[PDB]
Amino acid sequence: VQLVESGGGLVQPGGSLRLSCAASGFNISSSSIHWVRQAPGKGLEWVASISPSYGYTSYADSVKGRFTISADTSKNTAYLQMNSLRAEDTAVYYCARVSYWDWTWGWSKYEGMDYWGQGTLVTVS
Amino acid sequence: VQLVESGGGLVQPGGSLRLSCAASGFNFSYSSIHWVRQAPGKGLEWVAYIYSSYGYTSYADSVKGRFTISADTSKNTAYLQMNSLRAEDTAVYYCARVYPWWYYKYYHGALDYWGQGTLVTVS
Amino acid sequence: IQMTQSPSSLSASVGDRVTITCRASQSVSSAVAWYQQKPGKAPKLLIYSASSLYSGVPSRFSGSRSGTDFTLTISSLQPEDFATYYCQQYYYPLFTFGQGTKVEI
Amino acid sequence: IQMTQSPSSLSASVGDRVTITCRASQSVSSAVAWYQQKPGKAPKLLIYSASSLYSGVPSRFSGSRSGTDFTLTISSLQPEDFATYYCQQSYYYPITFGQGTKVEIK
Amino acid sequence: KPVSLSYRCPCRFFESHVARANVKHLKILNTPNCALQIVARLKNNNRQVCIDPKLKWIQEYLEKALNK
Amino acid sequence: CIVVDTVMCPNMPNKSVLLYTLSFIYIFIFVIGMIANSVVVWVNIQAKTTGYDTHCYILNLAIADLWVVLTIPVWVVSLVQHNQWPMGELTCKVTHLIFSINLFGSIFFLTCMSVDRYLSITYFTNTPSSRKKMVRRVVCILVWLLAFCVSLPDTYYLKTVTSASNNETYCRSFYPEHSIKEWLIGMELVSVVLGFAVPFSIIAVFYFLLARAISASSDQEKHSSRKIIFSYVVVFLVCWLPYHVAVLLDIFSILHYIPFTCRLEHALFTALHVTQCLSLVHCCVNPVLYSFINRNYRYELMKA
Ligand SMILES: CC(C)CCC[C@@H](C)[C@H]1CC[C@H]2[C@@H]3CC=C4C[C@@H](O)CC[C@]4(C)[C@H]3CC[C@]12C
Ligand SMILES: CC(C)CCC[C@@H](C)[C@H]1CC[C@H]2[C@@H]3CC=C4C[C@@H](O)CC[C@]4(C)[C@H]3CC[C@]12C
Ligand SMILES: CC(C)CCC[C@@H](C)[C@H]1CC[C@H]2[C@@H]3CC=C4C[C@@H](O)CC[C@]4(C)[C@H]3CC[C@]12C
Ligand SMILES: CC(C)CCC[C@@H](C)[C@H]1CC[C@H]2[C@@H]3CC=C4C[C@@H](O)CC[C@]4(C)[C@H]3CC[C@]12C
Ligand SMILES: CC(C)CCC[C@@H](C)[C@H]1CC[C@H]2[C@@H]3CC=C4C[C@@H](O)CC[C@]4(C)[C@H]3CC[C@]12C
Ligand SMILES: CC(C)CCC[C@@H](C)[C@H]1CC[C@H]2[C@@H]3CC=C4C[C@@H](O)CC[C@]4(C)[C@H]3CC[C@]12C
Ligand SMILES: CC(C)CCC[C@@H](C)[C@H]1CC[C@H]2[C@@H]3CC=C4C[C@@H](O)CC[C@]4(C)[C@H]3CC[C@]12C
Ligand SMILES: CC(C)CCC[C@@H](C)[C@H]1CC[C@H]2[C@@H]3CC=C4C[C@@H](O)CC[C@]4(C)[C@H]3CC[C@]12C
């Protein structure tokens, strides 16, 4: 199990960028991948999520309909398309996993984000 | 077919008697035998019946626990033994044979052939 | 399962039409039969089931059903048809016989 | 689904007892988690589900549930446990985190 | 259904719509569960089918066979 | 130009041995099933205070199995007397309705469990707990209604009789006289197409897909094992198949494809009873397979 983020870099307002979350040590289709962000010296806030297998995707209210998330199970990777950035979206983005264990199907606990990544810095001028 | 009764005769009150209905001319081990009464100058009345092959038996309410009924397939004869006879049993007894065909809701029960019957007195 | 037959007594003449009714205090699924006996001989079978006329009986007699009300109809009473008619049910293991109907000239 | 975390600052000394509380708005049936974040580092899970304890972390941390008032308790504080703590709910999407509680050396 | 709530014997349903012409082999069963029954063998489909004893010709044949 | 052939079946021989032994085994099944199912329901209700996420299907399946077991003693009483029915009319209808509803509930919930287990690792993996809880509740209500609808008919037509010849009571089914054959075949074929064929087919296919998926993912392979997955399907088959071959053979006898003989009646009677015994063993082997094996459950059992 190991997750690594890639992307980032300063981008002018109104631009777009790609953020890639790569996973290793496990098949990606059996565990949802979440994306969360942290503004400078602020608390966390959920952004997006995806299940690679059947492409289910939820989103966050404050950014509903402005992003795209696509998961490739072939390469065990997740892609977050950022577009229409505002000057206030600068933050640090982490991609986390929500493990699902099959050996306990009938009697399981509400899981939590197990393994995180270092994350990447996104800036807007 | 021919049914003949035997055993009819005088009996002291409270005594016992044994009647035999002998049937000749049909498969005894298939049909079922029925004994019925007729009091002097009155309507008919049902007593009991015996299903020969399997021995299933049923009895009328008025003679429950008193009359015993048996069937000898080897002798193809129906035996009815009566004990503790009361004063209201003096009558004429008839032996009949009925083939119990199967209908969806009920079994055939029309007494087809009736024997001549014999007079049983309780004096 | 008490069974009733009416009328208890009846009169008619040769060449007439007569009906005799039989009722059951409980429901019997078309399981009845009708015999006749002379004053001092053995009874004979006339009708079984509900209307299937016996093998060796003439066509004068005819049975019919209605709800629980079994009727026997006789047409053109011949001189030999002056006897006592009895109604029976055999649905339950305890058979029963009717009171008895008599017909005279 | 606002998740209110109190208190927002602490000054517990080494080896004392620490208690933190997270309060939900609606009813979430034991689907809360507690995360710890060091200054400028990736958060790491401490307690998953309402009360279970993540396999690998020390046993000092204890999670308890009561109605809709989740509580985190640390029996003893070590020099390596002075950081920020968040509470999360994983019941009603979107997932909302807490405000953030900070513990400082007295 | 549970076996107890069932009735088992050779013939469970009659078939009245049969013709005297298309009969080749009768059979008068006798079982404790359903007393005397009748089982026939149609000569066209060769399928053993029950028969209702109410049919007149059936009644005459069966009385002759048993009484003899 | 016809022939008359008479065949008299001998009176039914002694059957005390078979009836006594079956009643003996029924008592064991009743005890060992009631105890196990009660414990599972208790643990499931109690676990919710420890933060676990118990599954509704397990609780509903446990209730269904418990109801089926409760009515075994009625059959035991009705069986020692060689199929006689001393009890009253209401008892026969009520007992059959309870048995049929709560026996179809279990069969349907097995299929629902299989589909849910596959989806919970393929599709639901990124769905909020509230949505999946709502979906499961809806499916639970739907399955109950479907079982009730299937079971109602046979109970409606049920009625008692007293044989005119032998003079002992019985509880049988009476159908419209113009469609007697159609109803019998239909109501003994619905228990074979909606009871075994379709549920078993769905279970087999979906557990095979789950096995393939879990094998393809390395991380899940280490913890879970593929012996239990195939064990589920094999247990269902071994328990139910003999009964639904005896019933399928009973139907053939009704249609007279199988020539009649004195031996067939006795053989079919013994086979049906002996096979129904195993059909109910399935009702006690279920908790031992779905809940008593999960490591989390055992840890909760001792602590409660
Ligand atoms: C109920 C659970 C615990 C055990 C199930 C074991 C199986 C093998 C049991 C269930 C019913 C049993 C049958 C019940 C009755 C008889 C009749 C006897 O004359 C020979 C054995 C035989 C045929 C038994 C064989 C074993 C059997 C098939
Ligand atoms: C002998 C057997 C049939 C009786 C079983 C009765 C069933 C219907 C009873 C037993 C215990 C009950 C449960 C007790 C507690 C709860 C928790 C509540 O938040 C939802 C309902 C639920 C889950 C109940 C549903 C009904 C229930 C399962
Ligand atoms: C024929 C008759 C007697 C059968 C009656 C079946 C009863 C036991 C059925 C009918 C509806 C069922 C309930 C339907 C829904 C739920 C919600 C679930 O989360 C817990 C079980 C619970 C509470 C079920 C328990 C069993 C139940 C009460
Ligand atoms: C004879 C019986 C057992 C067959 C029952 C059919 C099963 C397979 C059917 C009945 C209702 C169906 C469910 C109805 C609704 C949904 C919600 C959807 O968002 C995912 C699929 C899901 C969860 C379905 C899965 C298949 C399902 C469970
Ligand atoms: C498939 C599920 C949902 C419903 C099953 C309902 C059952 C009770 C239905 C399915 C097919 C139906 C049969 C279809 C055809 C006939 C022929 C008709 O002349 C009498 C009714 C009868 C014999 C029906 C009886 C009821 C029956 C067996
Ligand atoms: C044959 C049946 C009807 C009688 C009851 C026996 C049941 C309880 C037996 C039959 C096969 C058994 C399984 C065989 C293999 C395994 C794998 C092992 O790693 C855990 C136990 C487990 C899963 C067993 C559990 C008990 C089990 C399911
Ligand atoms: C093969 C595995 C799954 C067991 C399934 C049970 C099978 C083998 C059982 C179920 C009912 C049984 C049949 C019941 C009745 C008869 C009629 C008899 O005159 C010969 C044996 C025969 C034909 C039996 C053979 C075995 C049988 C078919
Ligand atoms: C491998 C698994 C499926 C085997 C389970 C054993 C089953 C198939 C065994 C248990 C008891 C057995 C029955 C015991 C007695 C009889 C009566 C005999 O006159 C025909 C065979 C028949 C009906 C047997 C068929 C096979 C049977 C039902």
Author numbering:
A (entry chain F): 5 to 129
B (entry chain D): 5 to 127
C (entry chain C): 3 to 107
D (entry chain E): 3 to 108
E (entry chain B): 1 to 68
F (entry chain A): 26 to 329
Reproduce text from the manuscript describing this model.
In contrast, ACKR3 does not activate G proteins and is intrinsically β-arrestin biased. One of the best described functions of ACKR3 is “scavenging,” whereby it regulates extracellular concentrations of CXCL12 to shape chemokine gradients and maintain CXCR4 responsiveness by preventing overstimulation and down-regulation of the receptor. To address these questions, we used cryo–electron microscopy (cryo-EM) single-particle analysis to determine multiple unique structures of ACKR3 bound to a series of agonists: wild-type CXCL12 (CXCL12WT), CXCL12LRHQ (a higher-affinity variant of CXCL12 with alterations at its N terminus), and the small-molecule agonist CCX662 (13, 14).
CID25 binds to an extracellular epitope that includes elements from both ACKR3 and CXCL12, and CID24 binds to the cytoplasmic pocket of the active receptor. The globular domain of the chemokine interacts with the receptor N terminus and extracellular loops (ECLs), whereas its N terminus penetrates deep into the receptor orthosteric pocket. Notably, CXCL12 binds to ACKR3 in a distinctive way relative to all other reported receptor-chemokine complexes. The unexpected orientation of CXCL12 enables the β1 strand of the chemokine (26-LKILN-30) to form a parallel β-strand interaction with N-terminal residues 28-VVDTVMC-34 of ACKR3. This contrasts with canonical chemokine receptors wherein the receptor N terminus binds in a shallow groove flanked by the chemokine “N-loop” and “40s-loop,” defined as chemokine recognition site 1 (CRS1). P2 of CXCL12 packs against the side chains of ACKR3-W1002.60 and ACKR3-F1243.32, whereas the side chain of CXCL12-V3 packs against ACKR3-L2977.35 and ACKR3-H2987.36, and its backbone amide forms a hydrogen bond with ACKR3-Q3017.39. CXCL12-S4 potentially forms a hydrogen bond with the hydroxyl group of ACKR3-S1032.63. The side chain of CXCL12-L5 sits in a hydrophobic patch below the conserved C1173.25-C196ECL2 disulfide bond, Y7 is in proximity to R197ECL2, and the side chains of R8 and R12 engage D2756.58. In the CID25–ACKR3·CXCL12WT–CID24 complex, as well as the other six ACKR3 structures, no density was observed for the anticipated disulfide bond between Cys34 in the N terminus and Cys287 in ECL3 of ACKR3, despite being observed in all other reported chemokine receptors. The apparent absence of a disulfide bond at this position is consistent with the observation that mutation of these cysteines has little effect on ACKR3 function, in contrast to most canonical chemokine receptors.
